[PDB]
Design an enzyme around this catalytic site. Structure first.
Site, mmCIF file in Angstrom:
data_model
loop_
_atom_site.group_PDB
_atom_site.id
_atom_site.type_symbol
_atom_site.label_atom_id
_atom_site.label_comp_id
_atom_site.label_asym_id
_atom_site.label_seq_id
_atom_site.Cartn_x
_atom_site.Cartn_y
_atom_site.Cartn_z
ATOM 1 N N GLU A 199 0.822 -0.647 -0.084
ATOM 2 C CA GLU A 199 0.094 -0.037 -0.001
ATOM 3 C C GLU A 199 0.923 1.029 0.205
ATOM 4 O O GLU A 199 0.732 2.279 0.510
ATOM 5 C CB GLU A 199 -1.130 -0.170 0.993
ATOM 6 N N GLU A 246 7.077 7.943 -2.801
ATOM 7 C CA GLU A 246 7.290 7.486 -1.299
ATOM 8 C C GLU A 246 8.323 5.673 -1.975
ATOM 9 O O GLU A 246 8.825 5.934 -0.985
ATOM 10 C CB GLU A 246 6.092 6.697 -1.060
#
Ligand SMILES: Cc1cc(NC(=O)C(=O)N2C[C@@H](C)CC[C@@H]2c2ccc(O)cc2)cnc1N
Ligand SMILES: CSC[C@H]1O[C@@H](n2cnc3c(N)ncnc32)[C@H](O)[C@@H]1O
Ligand SMILES: [Cl-]
Ligand SMILES: [Cl-]
EC number: 2.1.1.320
Lengths: 301, 625
Positions: free
Chosen positions: B423, B432
């Site tokens: 996720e 990220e």
């Protein structure tokens, strides 16, 4: 109300005064009548007086009893003089403008009138039916001055901060018509019709230059630097070959010949000179008012 | 309800007037602070020596009333851009006088008009007043949607209104603002009060005022149509416009007198209140995000940083995304473990970034929904979260789940995985460092393993928001580059903005990336057809991901997953805004750069003009590995 706005002599030596308060707690307005024209501006020696809802920006006679008002409210007001001329009762009050009504003018007939505003709209009024006949957004800016043709009803002038001077004729499909000097000159401010050549008129600009215009020739025939500042009002004398009274924000009245040369000049006012009317009794007496609450009487050689 | 103000230019008794507007039902009042017809001299005798008082007294209202109820209006006689020297000088002095009196009264805002092309010296005087003692005073520039000059009746016999398609000519009013705004160097103190005339212009003109700081929408009592009964109303197009401005939460100002003389002033106000309360009531996304509109926030780095309880909480508080994750697993199980093998064959299933374990709980629900055996790892780097997992593991999951507490890059796993479930996708997807993380965790994936997700992709749109451009410009901080704030992205619920081209894709990533030349660095050129005369301020950032086959997630507005609030768009700004002429192409270049320790983006504009390369050598923004 210290700031006297309009000064219009009746056709019987009587005097009409229009005043607003442009400072203090109350921003109101009044209409006064002085059967002794030398007894002004004194409230105590006045024949008749009344307080409007709000200020007056412009004011004209509508015959002998009627007063037509351009209120800050956006209303055009009609005030009927009393039976004994003691009271000034509201005939009608009609909020049809969306900003200050800056100027009014009664048409040659006198059962119709035009009204300029700060909402850029011109309007033609039926003073009888008490409704708006026509509503014209001609201009691109707030309507500085409107002046009815002296002799023809459908015809009148309007000028405006969009630097346009419009000759109107309410008999055409495109009623307005742009006229004036060669280039875009400085802004027009005041419009006087000639009393005895309905072909020609004069306009005062914001840079203290009164100009003379022939509609026929649609060319600037003559113009003079009269004032240092803005020309706020222009009144012709009832004289056979009339003089021209030019008001200003330089607190000076000037009276001019047909060829726009300085005959008389008064520093009597120590604030702005607002309106002026000639005496219908003595044509060489001229009564100017100002924001200095002065009512000065000029003896014109 | 609607925040509504009355515009007057006539105030006989300020006590009474404000008493009346209040009862009518207005929240505030715009009024002239000095009398509008009361011109004043500052140079030439004898008018300058005019006895006072120049204006009504401050004691006429409570300081509270001045601070809450009164919007000040520049007197209409003041003309700082006159051609006449003397009128200039006089107007300059009068203008400061009226501005300074406004600030003396502590007035929320003060009004000034644009109603001409050259408003230079007006900007100059205001810019001075502003750059003279820091004060909460606000300035509403009064700008008409359509010029007076282009609205006039075609009644002038020798200067007629040209009936020829004037694309730039119909935008002239916005250029007035743009120029003024730009001279005043984008002051936060200068907003737009937008004046709406009777005839609207083309959509494209009304489209200009997107991403412009509209604190007010002025509606003259003119523009109102009269209905069957006698009430005021508006054209269906005027309504659409109101509904556009209600989403910006503008204050609505009513100017001009009552032309519906059979009603009150309630009437005008009440139509507006009726419009606002019969609008599509707020959806799951809009309702949740109602505070965060055009709120800049630094993008999270769940790798380099450890997220907080309440940070993890709002991730979990998004049902749709986990339904989707559950389904995605449900399908993969079936496709992998044949019906006949159901009991003989268990799947080794490894969550990589398991947080507090909503993906673990999803992985369970998915297995018993699809009747197949699973063994669960829950790999988690954040040791604060690991506390939460181990507390779940012990109380509820038991030894089915094996909570692992390391970096998925570091972990030396006992067996290999059928499915890895991540996720760890930000708002620009790869921002990220999912690619670096799942690349390190690939060596313990079975030779035939599935990744959920297996593919994700980042999308850029050029946007115009002088508003958000001012938000970023306001993020300058002492003790770093003064422009550093432009060379970094911000997660923001982009609201007051304008999309100039449909989003195109930027970077795509695959898992498992089986390629022998694994290189997560990128160079993508994008060419954006623009079809307005707008101003570039930055690039909206969105993402789409394939979890497994026909199960996807997206924040890309077109394909946007319905009712999914785990993600807001990112925003790559640019230092100097860029003017873009209609039918020109915006060319923006993006790099994903990386060394051993940092990952960053660099980005430039190569067309129509060239921009400066933003964030060279991650000097202003890096992402820790
Ligand atoms: C699952 C996931 C999800 C996200 N989500 C986000 O970044 C995001 O859009 N946010 C906006 C709003 C939902 C508040 C939380 C968060 C946020 C908070 C503060 C901050 O400074 C930046 C964003 C990011 N990464 C991952 N991996
Ligand atoms: C649920 S949002 C991101 C989550 O993934 C976890 N995570 C991010 N990067 C890594 C990594 N390299 N190894 C293990 N967990 C990670 C973080 O601890 C966070 O809980
Ligand atoms: Cl202020
Ligand atoms: Cl989570």
């Amino acid at each position: 109300e210290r700031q006297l706005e309009a000064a219009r002599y009746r056709s019987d030596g009587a005097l009409l005064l229009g005043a607003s308060s442009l400072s203090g707690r109350c921003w109101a307005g009044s209409l006064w009548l002085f059967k002794d024209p030398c007894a002004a501006p004194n409230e105590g020696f006045c024949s008749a007086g009344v307080q409007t809802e709000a200020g007056v920006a412009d004011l004209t006679w509508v015959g002998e009893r009627g007063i037509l008002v351009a209120s800050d409210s956006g209303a055009v007001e009609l005030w009927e003089l009393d039976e004994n001329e003691t009271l000034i009762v509201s005939k009608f009050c009609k909020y049809e403008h969306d900003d200050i009504v800056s100027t009014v003018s009664v048409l040659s007939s006198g059962t119709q009138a035009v009204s300029g505003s700060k909402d850029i709209c011109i309007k033609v009024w039926d003073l009888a039916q008490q409704v708006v006949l026509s509503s014209y957004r001609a201009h691109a800016a707030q309507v500085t001055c409107v002046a009815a043709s002296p002799h023809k009803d459908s015809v009148f002038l309007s000028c405006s901060e969009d630097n346009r001077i419009l000759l109107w004729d309410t008999r055409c499909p495109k009623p307005a018509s742009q006229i004036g000097c060669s280039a875009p000159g400085y802004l027009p401010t005041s419009l006087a019709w000639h009393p005895q050549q309905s072909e020609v008129f004069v306009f005062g600009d914001e840079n203290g230059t009164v100009s003379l215009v022939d509609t026929k020739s649609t060319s600037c025939v003559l113009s003079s630097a009269v004032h240092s500042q803005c020309v706020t009002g222009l009144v012709f004398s009832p004289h056979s070959v009339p003089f021209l009274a030019s008001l200003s924000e330089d607190c000076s009245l000037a009276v001019l010949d047909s060829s726009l040369s300085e005959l008389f000049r008064s520093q009597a006012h120590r604030d702005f000179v607002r309106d002026a009317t000639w005496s219908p009794l003595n044509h060489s007496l001229l009564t100017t008012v100002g924001w200095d609450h002065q009512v000065v009487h000029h003896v014109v050689p | 309800r609607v925040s509504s103000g009355r515009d007057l230019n006539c105030v006989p008794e300020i006590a009474d007037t404000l008493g009346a507007v209040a009862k009518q039902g207005f929240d505030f009042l715009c009024m002239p602070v000095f009398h509008p017809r009361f011109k004043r001299e500052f140079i030439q005798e004898p008018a300058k020596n005019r006895p006072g008082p120049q204006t009504r007294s401050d004691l006429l209202l409570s300081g509270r009333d001045w601070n809450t109820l009164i919007v000040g209006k520049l007197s209409p006689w003041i003309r700082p851009d006159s051609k006449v020297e003397k009128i200039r000088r006089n107007s300059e002095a009068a203008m400061l006088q009226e501005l300074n009196f406004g600030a003396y009264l502590g007035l929320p805002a003060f009004l000034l008009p644009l109603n001409q092309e050259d408003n230079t010296n007006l900007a100059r005087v205001l810019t001075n007043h502003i750059h003279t003692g820091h004060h909460s005073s606000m300035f509403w520039m009064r700008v008409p949607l359509v010029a007076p000059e282009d609205l006039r009746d075609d009644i002038i016999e020798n200067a007629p209104t040209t009936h020829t398609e004037e694309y730039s000519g119909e935008e002239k009013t916005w250029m007035w603002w743009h120029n003024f705004r730009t001279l005043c160097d984008y002051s936060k103190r200068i907003a737009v009060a937008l004046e709406i005339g009777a005839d609207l212009p083309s959509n494209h003109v009304i489209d200009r005022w997107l991403g412009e700081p509209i604190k007010a929408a002025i509606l003259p009592t003119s523009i109102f149509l009269t209905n069957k009964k006698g009430f005021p109303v508006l054209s269906k197009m005027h309504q659409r416009l109101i509904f556009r401005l209600l989403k910006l939460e503008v204050q609505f100002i009513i100017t001009g007198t009552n032309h519906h003389s059979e009603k009150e002033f309630c009437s005008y106000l009440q139509y507006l209140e009726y419009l606002s309360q019969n609008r599509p009531p707020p959806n799951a996304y809009e309702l949740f995000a109602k505070g965060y509109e055009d709120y800049l926030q630094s993008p999270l780095q769940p790798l380099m940083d450890n997220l907080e309880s309440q940070t993890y909480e709002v991730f979990e508080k998004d049902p749709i995304k986990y339904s989707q994750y559950q389904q995605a697993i449900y399908k993969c199980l079936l496709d992998r473990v044949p019906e006949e093998e159901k009991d003989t064959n268990v799947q080794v299933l490894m969550v990589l970034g398991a947080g507090r374990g909503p993906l673990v709980n999803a992985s369970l629900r998915a297995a018993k929904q699809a009747d197949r055996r699973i063994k669960l790892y829950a790999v988690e780097k954040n040791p604060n979260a690991v506390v939460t997992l181990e507390n779940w593991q012990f109380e509820e999951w038991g030894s089915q789940v094996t909570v692992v507490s390391s970096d998925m890059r570091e972990w030396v796993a006992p067996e290999k995985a059928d499915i890895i479930v991540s996720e760890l996708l930000g708002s620009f997807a790869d921002n990220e460092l999912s690619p670096e993380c799942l690349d390190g965790a690939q060596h313990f994936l079975k030779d035939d393993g599935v990744s959920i997700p297996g593919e994700y992709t980042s999308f850029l749109a050029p946007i115009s928001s002088s508003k958000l451009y001012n938000e970023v410009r306001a993020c300058r901080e002492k003790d770093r580059d003064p422009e550093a704030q432009f060379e970094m992205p911000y997660v923001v619920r982009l609201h007051n903005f304008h999309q100039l081209s449909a989003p195109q894709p930027c970077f795509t990533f695959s898992h498992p990336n089986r390629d022998p030349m694994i290189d997560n660095n990128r160079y993508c050129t994008l060419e954006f057809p623009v079809e307005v005369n707008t101003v570039l301020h930055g690039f909206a950032g969105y993402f789409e991901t394939v979890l497994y086959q026909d199960i996807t997630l997206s924040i890309r507005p077109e394909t946007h997953s319905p009712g999914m609030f785990s993600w807001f768009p990112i925003l790559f700004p640019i230092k100097q805004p860029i003017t873009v002429r209609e039918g020109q192409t915006i060319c923006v270049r993006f790099w994903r750069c990386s060394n051993s320790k940092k990952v960053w983006y660099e980005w430039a504009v190569t067309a129509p003009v060239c921009s400066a390369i933003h964030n060279p050598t991650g000097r202003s923004y890096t992402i820790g590995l």
